[PDB]
Amino acid sequence: RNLRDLLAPWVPDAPSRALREMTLDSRVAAAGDLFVAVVGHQADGRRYIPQAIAQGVAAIIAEAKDEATDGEIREMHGVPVIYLSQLNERLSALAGRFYHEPSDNLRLVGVTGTNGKTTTTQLLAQWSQLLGEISAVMGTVGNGLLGKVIPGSAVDVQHELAGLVDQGATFCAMEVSSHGLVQHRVAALKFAASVFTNLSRDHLDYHGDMEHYEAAKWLLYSEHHCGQAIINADDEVGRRWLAKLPDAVAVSMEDHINPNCHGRWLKATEVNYHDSGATIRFSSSWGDGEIESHLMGAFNVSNLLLALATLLALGYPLADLLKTAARLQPVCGRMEVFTAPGKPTVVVDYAHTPDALEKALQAARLHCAGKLWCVFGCGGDRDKGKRPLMGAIAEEFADVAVVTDDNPRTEEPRAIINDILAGMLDAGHAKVMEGRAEAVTCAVMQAKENDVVLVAGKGHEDYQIVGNQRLDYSDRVTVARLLGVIA
């Protein structure tokens, strides 16, 4: 890594200097580093140039605004200070070059939208790895090779992607946030494909507002290297964009493919939501098929179809994708199904808010031939407002509500339960059982073979906080043991 080579596309005359790491933070800026001095929200990195120099940085690239002309090379205490205009906009490119263009050395797929990013990225990484990639994810759960995802500027993004390339990754599925996009955090990444799940963007009822939002997003899209575009046609905004993008792939499970456009498409023609997943029949411009998914609910059918369409668009053979679909797993503790011969289906989900609980129950209901049970509680020593709302939801969307404890902390457990029951029309119809393990057991043991039990609020978490004690407890393990299976 050399300053002169780093800057060659933009500044021809730049001095030769060996460089170690690239950093925006003067505090960690060490001997031989490149310090990048940016102007951001209420902070100006240029003010920390002396500190960085004093700490022995090899070189500095700095925002030119109000200080210098674009490409101006200065020297301070023998340290080159090179000024660039619109440095925030160019930081991704600068870091990309610094880290040897990681997105040109693996197949990077970006997933954007309000919901389903995490699941879709996981599915992309898993499925590609099933077909022989070494896959990785970058998202809200963390970054890493599949199964080793460890829990954020344009520099950090490039650095992390380079780390993955160094570890052998040949495929990366990345969550891209609206905020990340707008702040130029992925500006220079070469996406092989870009996936759009959905837009629950409230506050856009005014046509001028929807117009400006769309305009701003279109402008950003046009500036990025998005590669193959894969768009959920079951989303309203999705459809409007598809009408403008004849090379985009349209994905639907609700009959929104327009076959007159002769574009690429994939659509679920029928779905059987059953006691251990979903049987998905689909047609596509690549051929037709049937997938056995072990994911639960309609949203996860959508997520799966988006991943499928993406991998098809990138040239992964349909026959191979079909052969590996049954190996795709849920995100741990997210609508995670547990089944055993002749027992109720049990779903463990992290849902711990009214909206999440409603969604989880509606999803579970699809797979439920019999009665739907909901085992849940609310956290103690936290905002109490959600409690009656979760009670009303459980009463409405489940057939049996089993109210129990969920991290009661130092609050009287029964008081929490009372707040929950208060939200019900008929609290007397709810079951209450304290000891969470006992409540889960009660549902699982009483539920009929064709019933579904949703165990909500913990997901992957393996603790129950009672008092100041973090007790070893897992819904997944409890359910697994009851069903005679392995979590």
Swiss-Prot record:
Q: Which domain of life is it from?
A: Bacteria
Task: For this UniProt record, give its keywords in alphabetical order, as a comma-separated list.
Answer: ATP-binding, Cell cycle, Cell division, Cell shape, Cell wall biogenesis/degradation, Cytoplasm, Ligase, Magnesium, Nucleotide-binding, Peptidoglycan synthesis
Question: Sorted alphabetically, which HAMAP family does this protein's record hold?
Answer: MurE
Report what the protein is called. Answer: UDP-N-acetylmuramoyl-L-alanyl-D-glutamate--2,6-diaminopimelate ligase
- Please state where this protein is localized: Cytoplasm
Per the entry, which co-factors are needed?
Mg(2+)
Q: Mainly localized where? A: cytoplasm
Which organism was this protein described from?
Escherichia coli (strain K12)
Phylogenetic classification of the source organism: Bacteria, Pseudomonadati, Pseudomonadota, Gammaproteobacteria, Enterobacterales
Q: Name one Pfam family in it.
A: Mur_ligase_M
- SUPFAM superfamilies in the record: MurD-like peptide ligases, catalytic domain (SSF53623), MurD-like peptide ligases, peptide-binding domain (SSF53244), MurE/MurF N-terminal domain (SSF63418)
- List each coiled-coil range: none
Q: Which family is this protein grouped under? A: Belongs to the MurCDEF family. MurE subfamily.
Q: Where is this motif: Meso-diaminopimelate recognition motif?
A: 406-409
Q: Note how its activity is modulated.
A: Activated by potassium phosphate.
Residues given in the record as ATP binding sites? G113, T114, N115, G116, K117, T118, T119
Q: How is it modified after translation?
A: Carboxylation is probably crucial for Mg(2+) binding and, consequently, for the gamma-phosphate positioning of ATP.
Q: Where on the chain is N6-carboxylysine found, per UniProt?
A: K217
Q: What does this protein do?
A: Catalyzes the addition of meso-diaminopimelic acid to the nucleotide precursor UDP-N-acetylmuramoyl-L-alanyl-D-glutamate (UMAG) in the biosynthesis of bacterial cell-wall peptidoglycan. Is also able to use many meso-diaminopimelate analogs as substrates, although much less efficiently, but not L-lysine.
Q: Where does meso-2,6-diaminopimelate bind?
A: R382, D406, N407, P408, R409, G457, E461
